[PDB]
């Protein structure tokens, strides 16, 4: 998509050569913010095709608080198995903490059961949040959380939400990103009968790799396409009640995926 | 400065009006990005009078871990004699989850000593992280954090720094805050020997409250002056170590003061 596009003809023209901690070596800009209006359809990118099968399963898995790579296994979704544990735990990561941030003293904070009920009784609050940013655990984790910190917005009968995240990936990871939250963002509007409204991203430590360059030159030469619309077949009695075939994406017409090498 | 009043300017030609929890009407926005280059100068607000010794003082109380305001009393710092208790406590805010933020083993962490370290061992992290926004102990806190999370990257060697503010005051908080910042980077700068970069601030739900609309529309009216410079006259041995007198503003002649009521 627009936006996009030009966040990688930013890093390519701004970017700056790094080396990061896996030795590959990078080009980086620091602090970037794009925003998608969900009224004008889902944004996931068209100059690529990218598959919505593992994106979905992995929001679901974070919804239930499960942190063990067990449910993803389960629906054929690698992505988290190459930072899994034996038994297949990654830590207190995305997902512990949404569901269950431990307090100090033994109990447990529902980030998204707070934030649930913050959207339907008191929508004007300026501090509707979820942080995945857990300090006092980030020792824990198979990794430190990409993306973050969330923040929810009520306005005209609108839902909006603003994503920080520090490291990003601009080829891989990021219309990854995108397209999860922009997924949440439907499911708590229709938890909450509100219209969509815009999904702000906003980055930290914004890269692409040097093995990526040639995938990225590619992408560039081709022309963004009409964006497709998600539809939701059904409304749960909860947000933790969606199911996989819960939801279509309708309209996707994208240019043919493109292969590239994962650093890790 | 221009970025500051192009930012007022932003909120009253496309914010709309909400209800705080103060009664207060205000009008808003939502996700909005500011870059500051410090090289071209301290970002002080010129278009009106502000006050440095609050600034400092306050800066130097987060940097003790002290959450009391009983030293901001012994330097006369009114501030936040409105939020602390009959002891003057505020609970376990920004200096204290700066300083201690506690983890669940009984374990505290340092952020600040630990970016420090990061900065000098480890500058091409992506990681390099400080969070107020303790999800376990906001409901000890005598108001919620605004200035929230922070991250720092260095390239060129220079130091530049994040900011996210989950809900911005624009008239009265946001000097503030961008001032404060801009002098933890130089701070942090100076103690890593690193050239500062840039402060970039990215706002959440940023408004104007509606008893601030005239004084908003008078700044608005003025001419920014040329931005005053920041002095240090000594390295302390720790970014723990500085004092109101390390500290020299020169060149600052601002247009009149304007004074605004503050919601609470
Ligand atoms: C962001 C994020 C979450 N993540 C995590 C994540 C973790 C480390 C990273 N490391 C690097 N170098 N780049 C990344 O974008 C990245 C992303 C993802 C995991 C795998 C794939 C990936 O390799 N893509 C495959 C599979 C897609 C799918 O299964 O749906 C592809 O062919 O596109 C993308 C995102
Ligand atoms: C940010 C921050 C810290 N803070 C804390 C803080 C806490 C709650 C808030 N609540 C609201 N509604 N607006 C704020 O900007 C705000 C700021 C400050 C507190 C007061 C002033 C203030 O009254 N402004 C006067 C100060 C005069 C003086 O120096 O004594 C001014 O005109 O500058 C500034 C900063
Ligand atoms: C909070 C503290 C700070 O340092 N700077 C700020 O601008 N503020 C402002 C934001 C808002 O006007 C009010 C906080 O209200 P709430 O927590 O958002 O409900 O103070
Ligand atoms: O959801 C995710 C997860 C990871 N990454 C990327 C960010 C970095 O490229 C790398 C993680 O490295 P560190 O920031 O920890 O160094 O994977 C993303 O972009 N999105």
């Keep these: 998509m627009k936006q996009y596009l030009e966040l990688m003809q930013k890093v390519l023209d701004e970017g700056t050569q790094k080396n990061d901690r896996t030795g590959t070596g990078t080009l980086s800009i620091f602090g970037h913010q794009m925003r998608f209006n969900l009224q004008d359809g889902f944004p996931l990118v068209t100059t690529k095709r990218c598959h919505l099968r ?126 999860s939250y922009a997924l949440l963002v439907h499911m708590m509007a229709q938890q909450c009968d509100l219209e969509v409204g815009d999904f702000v991203w906003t980055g930290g430590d914004t890269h692409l790799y040097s093995n990526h360059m040639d995938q990225t030159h590619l992408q560039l030469s081709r022309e963004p396409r009409p964006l497709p619309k998600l539809i939701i077949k059904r409304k749960p009695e909860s947000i933790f009640d969606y199911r996989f075939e819960d939801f279509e994406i309708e309209g996707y017409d994208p240019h043919p995926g493109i292969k590239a090498p994962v650093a890790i």
């Design 54 to 179: 593992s994106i979905i399963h992995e929001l679901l898995w974070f919804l239930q608080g499960d942190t063990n790579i067990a449910y993803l296994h389960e629906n054929n979704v690698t992505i988290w198995d190459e930072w899994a544990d034996e038994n297949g735990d990654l830590g207190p990561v995305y997902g512990k903490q949404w569901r269950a941030w431990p307090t100090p003293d033994g109990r447990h904070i529902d980030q998204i059961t707070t934030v649930l009920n913050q959207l339907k009784n008191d929508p004007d609050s300026r501090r509707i949040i979820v942080s995945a940013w857990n300090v006092g655990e980030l020792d824990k984790m198979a990794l430190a959380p990409c993306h973050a910190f969330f923040q929810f917005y009520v306005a005209d009968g609108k839902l909006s939400c603003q994503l920080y995240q520090r490291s990003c990936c601009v080829f891989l990871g990021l219309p990854f990103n995108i397209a």
